[PDB]
Amino acid sequence: MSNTELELLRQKADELNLQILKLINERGNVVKEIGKAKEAQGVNRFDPVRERTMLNNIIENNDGPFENSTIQHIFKEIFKAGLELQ
Numbered sequence: 008m009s010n011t012e013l014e015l016l017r018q019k020a021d022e023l024n025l026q027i028l029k030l031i032n033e034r035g036n037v038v039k040e041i042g043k044a045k046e047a048q049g050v051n052r053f054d055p056v057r058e059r060t061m062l063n064n065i066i067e068n069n070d071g072p073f074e075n076s077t078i079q080h081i082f083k084e085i086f087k088a089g090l091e092l093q
Contacts, residue, residue, distance in 0.1 A: 042093030051090040
């Protein structure tokens, strides 16, 4: 592989990193707005049926190179961060 090709692939990866960052943050703003609406609780409510449905739907759309468990784990981390935000 040439040095130019290595740089091109790594620049694509960096651009994708930044786009993922942008979408995670936009999602964060959304989930904060949703949190504003909910009723105050002793611990951050994430309805389990909605969560399990969301995860399974994400998995249904998983045609990428990662196993479904990997995708599920990453999106559980994203979700948890969101909850902390609320």
